[PDB]
């Protein structure tokens, strides 16, 4: 259906970097705000970061600043999440969702977001 395909991520050692990508399947994503969420097995999924309908306005979780940077290419209908200095506490499946609204908020409440994709797993290891 109308989804938001995620890609990037995999196995990476501690301190390294990684890049996630959201592509819009069967909808234009420039109309909505977009957010990346993480989900560790068992736990409820929390908000990682999010971006306005345009660029310009951004928001990150307090445990994520300032290692990550989210950005938007509305021409290519794609949202990027750059990840630097990864910690093992960043492991888990990463999901991307589109909001009902144009506004992004640090709250990053699950219900505001839809069109979830299947997600991409990331894992950070101490030893390598």
């Amino acid at each position: 259906q109308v989804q938001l395909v995620e890609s990037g991520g995999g196995l990476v050692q501690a301190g390294g970097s990684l890049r996630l990508s959201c592509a819009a399947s069967e909808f234009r994503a420039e109309h909505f705000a977009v957010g990346w969420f993480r989900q560790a097995p068992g736990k409820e999924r929390e908000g990682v970061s999010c971006v306005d309908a345009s660029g310009d306005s951004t928001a990150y979780a307090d445990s994520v600043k300032g290692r990550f940077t989210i950005s938007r290419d509305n021409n290519k209908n794609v949202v990027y999440l750059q990840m630097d200095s990864l910690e093992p506490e960043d492991t888990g499946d990463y999901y991307c969702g589109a909001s009902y609204f144009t506004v992004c908020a640090k709250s990053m409440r699950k219900i505001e977001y839809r069109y979830w994709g299947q997600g991409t797993q990331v894992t950070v290891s101490s030893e390598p």
Partner: peptide
């Protein structure tokens, strides 16, 4: 309503009662 939407209009936000600076 969200305080700082950029388009001319926006979806209203229906929620439990709370004090939000948002």
């Amino acid at each position: 309503t969200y305080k700082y939407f950029k388009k001319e209009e926006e979806k209203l936000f229906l929620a439990p009662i709370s004090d939000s600076d948002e």
